[PDB]
């Protein structure tokens, strides 16, 4: 795999979103990987509905949090609507997939990256955007304004984001806190520290959709 991967340069990343007050990071995370893999497989970049995952993933808890892997299973089992048809409301409502006609996209499945393994994560990111989790509760993460982030942070992972690239000394992360946070909405997190958790627990739990 190359020394640098940046899926934004391959036109595989949609603009940065702001999840707002709702704890829907897991659905934003999931959607980034769906948007990425649909572009990689079909050549079209589209935006898909975080709101639909929020309303329709019964394993998750709406704005109270959820599971990227569960949302990814939803999309493989059923599909997902365009974001324009099922726009983000920042509040869990009832699942409106049937009202909004046929799904715009469907995946074939969900894989887990083998946890606590930096090379396994980078291999996956070389192929497509990957849903990853990290500890975002710490003030240093929240006030991040740019640079390679090394922490301080612990391993109490609480926030699902999407890795859309990496370099020699960082993993490139699309966050869902708007374009004002971090590096236009992105964070570069240090890798290769020999901490198998990853910094801020980045290697704890990573998933990507499969599409054939
Ligand atoms: C993340 C966010 O929106 O910033 C959001 O709180 C979230 O989805 N958190 C996850 C943990 C990460 C995905 C590692 C989470 O807390 N998942 C468990 C479900 C939420 C707690 N359960 C209930 N019933 N409230």
With a CB cutoff of 8 Å and minimum separation 6, the contacts of 59 are 66, 67, 70
Task: Judge whether 25 is annotated as a binding position.
Answer: yes
* Annotation says 175 is catalytic: yes
For residue 148, list its beta bridge partners.
188
Structure solved via: X-ray
CB burial of residue 77 (10 Å; 0-12, 13-18, 19+): exposed
Pocket test for ligand 1, best of 17, 23, 135, 163 (most atoms within 8 A of CB): 23
Tell which atom from ligand 1 comes closest to the C-alpha of 157. Answer: 14
DSSP element (H, E) containing 132: strand 130-134
Pocket test for ligand 1, best of 53, 65, 131 (most atoms within 8 A of CB): 65
Exposed e or buried b per residue across 101-117, where buried means at least 16 C-beta atoms within 10 angstroms of its C-beta = eebbbbbeebeebeebe
d(CA 81, CA 35): 11
Annotated active-site residue in 22, 63, 153, 159: 159
Report which DSSP code applies to 113: P
Sign, Cα dihedral of 183, 133, 165, 21: negative
Query: Between the CA of residue 38 and those of 71, 78, 202, 211, what are the distances in Å?
Result: 16, 15, 24, 8
Domains assigned to the chain: 1-212 (3.90.70.10)
Q: Are 66 and 27 in contact (CB under 8 A)?
A: yes
d(CA 73, CA 190): 30
With a CB cutoff of 8 Å and minimum separation 6, the contacts of 203 are 115, 116, 117, 118, 121, 132, 196, 197
For residue 207, list its beta bridge partners.
112, 131
Residues 112-117: contacts with CB within 8 Å, 24+ apart?
A: 112/69, 112/205, 112/206, 112/207, 113/206, 113/207, 113/208, 115/203, 115/204, 115/205, 115/206, 116/196, 116/197, 116/198, 116/203, 116/204, 117/196, 117/203
For 189, the token pair is 């997190």
SS3 helix, strand, coil % of the chain, rounded to 5? Answer: 25, 20, 55
d(CA 133, CA 120): 15
């Amino acid at each position: 795999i190359p020394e640098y991967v940046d899926w934004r340069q391959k036109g595989a990343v949609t603009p940065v979103k702001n999840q707002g007050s709702c704890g829907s990071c897991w659905a934003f995370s999931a959607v980034v990987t769906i948007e990425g893999i649909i572009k990689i497989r079909t050549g079209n970049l589209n935006e898909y509905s975080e709101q639909e995952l929020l309303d329709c993933d019964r394993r998750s808890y709406g704005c109270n949090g959820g599971y990227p892997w569960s949302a990814l299973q939803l999309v493989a089992q059923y599909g997902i609507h365009y974001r324009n048809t099922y726009p983000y409301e920042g509040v869990q409502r009832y699942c409106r997939s049937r009202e909004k006609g046929p799904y715009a996209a469907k995946t074939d499945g969900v894989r887990q990256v083998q946890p606590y393994n930096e090379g396994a994560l980078l291999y996956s990111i070389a192929n497509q955007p990957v849903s990853v989790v990290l500890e975002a509760a710490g003030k240093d993460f929240q006030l991040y304004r740019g640079g390679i982030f090394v922490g301080p942070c612990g391993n109490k992972v609480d926030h699902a984001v999407a890795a859309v690239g990496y370099g020699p000394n960082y993993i490139l992360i699309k966050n869902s806190w708007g374009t004002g946070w971090g590096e236009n909405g992105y964070i570069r997190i240090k890798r290769g520290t020999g901490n198998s958790y990853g910094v801020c627990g980045l290697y704890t739990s990573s998933f990507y959709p499969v599409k054939n």
